[PDB]
Ligand code: HEM
Ligand code: HEM
């Protein structure tokens with residue numbers, strides 16, 4: 001669970017980097033599909049499964065939109081992400097192991113783009129947060 | 143998170159198999175150390191880190207007493223297992239990834255011992271439950 | 285992977301006594317229930333939004349037997365498992381778009397269903413060898429994913 | 431492991447330009463803070479009660495440098511990494527009793543720290559090669575645990 005310290009840390013970092021959510025999204029989804037190409041399986045309905053492609057760019061927008069959503073719903077991520085959980089469970093059937101992969105890639109992305117803001121303290125809190133997002137997204141699965 | 147459905151299924155199963163907790167603990171820890179020898183790193187202070195050893199046998203009793211507690215605290219595992227979290231976090235420094243390993247071993251043990259009771263529905267609720275157990279033990283770590 | 289003689293013997297014994305038409309449907313059924321995202325690849329097999337509808341499903345039961353028999357070639361090709369499964373891996377990746385993590389999950393379900401059938405004979409050493417085998421076959425099935 | 435020439439090039443490029451005295455302490459500090467159970471092995475290191483203590487601990491600093499330079503042998507032996515690390519594997523298992531999962535955690539911390547240093551230059555491809563290299567080293571460091 002996230003303590004008040006953790007929530008304030010996530011809120012403060014997102015206050016700082018939120019402006020760049022779209023670019024963070026493209027960079028993270030791009031890293032996911034190149035470094036972890038097994039993930040491309042979920043996007044076979046797209047011809048353009050390649051770093052920075054139009055479907056990846058536009059999609060990265062939606063995903064970090066979901067993270068901004070999670071930041072606003074951080075006191076209750078289960079309730080907050082229930083609709084997104086339903087989407088990944090029944091429409092998308094995404095194995096929850098892949099949330100861990102994307103979470104690593106987002107951390108890597110933020111480290112590249114905000115090294116000063118991404119302190120070890122920011123990191124442990126955001127990692128706890130993203131693990132919590134991952135747990136909430138699995139809510140409707142089984 | 144566990145639904146009423148999940149809670150009912152775990153309680154129902156533990157009602158049936160709880161009297162065998164001691165034997166399940168021995169079996170589960172024995173498999174863990176045999177199948178996943180890296181977990182032995184946490185038992186370096188025992189001379190007999192072998193399957194069914196006096197030390198593994200007695201410890202298995204205590205681990206399943208731990209699972210017994212969790213079933214009794216199923217409505218609030220974070221609170222219920224706080225002391226165990228503090229001990230695994232502050233005293234033992236057990237990487238929480240190992241909880242997933244022991245969890246799989248418990249499921250294998252229960253399938254070998256209680257085939258009629260361990261139905262696929264009992265399985266999904268118990269696996270959900272053991273993952274909640276792992277997260278609850280993870281609580282005091284960071 | 286370097287196999288020991290005991291390991292080859294355990295796997296050999298297990299597959300020679302394997303009731304495939306029993307274990308295969310059970311392991312895939314349990315996978316589809318415990319890990320319901322694996323239902324991604326079974327759409328037209330019928331309605332499996334239920335455990336009893338899953339367990340009663342013949343298309344599902346027929347695919348569990350095939351999949352279990354997909355292990356036989358590794359049993360015979362124990363020192364050539366990556367090469368032997370290369371075609372199957374490429375099929376699952378480019379044809380079927382199967383997330384390879386699902387192979388691990390199914391593998392755990394087969395272990396658990398096999399553990400229930402074998403009971404006390406499914407010792408710690410037996411489970412180690414059997415999981416070792418599946419581990420190598422799972423590596424092989426995910427190897428040609430690009 | 432199969433290395434491509436471009437993977438070899440990237441690994442070489444990264445380590446020839448690595449400031450070990452900067453990245454090493456940063457990565458081990460980060461690991462101890464984000465994954466505090468790794469502190470299990472640093473009881474003699476002085477104060478670690480909170481992040482600032484760890485970032486400020488000169489002993490954690492010199493060990494991070496040592497661990498980072500421990501990678502040098504695999505760069506210098508890309509095709510024989512399992513063998514090259516066998517003695518280190520045996521050491522970590524029998525004398526230090528370090529959980530090998532912690533190797534993966536420190537690895538990811540090294541990647542995230544290198545990513546902050548390299549910035550925009552740490553491309554996805556760069557990441558893929560660097561992670562691949564670390565994954566092959568970690569595999570090797572866990573190999574002698576029995
Ligand atoms: C940080 C974790 C994640 C978040 C916040 C997230 C969020 C989202 C959002 C906001 C959408 C679009 C909603 C809509 O259009 O109705 C979406 C769709 C989708 N997501 Fe996720 N997701 C995450 C992780 C993943 C992962 C790990 C994968 C697979 C590897 C995945 C695969 C998909 C796919 C395939 C779709 C549909 C895209 C399309 O068809 O264009 N998601 N997700
Ligand atoms: C299902 C999750 C687990 C539960 C419920 C659990 C439960 C417990 C309990 C109740 C004790 C206290 C025993 C006593 O009173 O002396 C204990 C101790 C301990 N646990 Fe766990 N445990 C779990 C997972 C693990 C794992 C996965 C490991 C390592 C791989 C581990 C390592 C230890 C060790 C090293 C001790 C101290 C043993 C001794 O020195 O006597 N635990 N655990």
Ligand code: HEM
Pocket residue numbers: 322323325350351352353354355372375376380382386387390391425
């Ligand atoms: C132990 C792991 C597995 C083994 C050994 C295995 C083996 C096989 C084999 C031998 C085939 C026949 C291919 C052909 O049509 O020529 C097959 C087909 C198939 N498998 Fe796998 N499989 C495994 C896991 C999975 C998983 C986890 C899934 C999905 C979640 C999956 C879904 C399929 C599908 C959809 C087909 C094609 C069916 C068709 O012909 O329409 N398999 N498998």
Ligand code: HEM
Pocket residue numbers: 468469471472496497498499500501518521522526528532533536537571
């Ligand atoms: C990238 C992964 C790692 C590599 C390449 C590595 C390499 C090394 C090297 C080169 C040594 C010194 C050899 C000697 O003095 O005999 C060493 C020792 C040691 N390592 Fe690791 N290491 C790694 C990860 C870790 C982790 C994750 C930890 C625990 C959290 C750890 C704990 C230790 C300890 C406690 C020592 C003993 C040194 C002393 O007594 O001062 N190492 N390792």
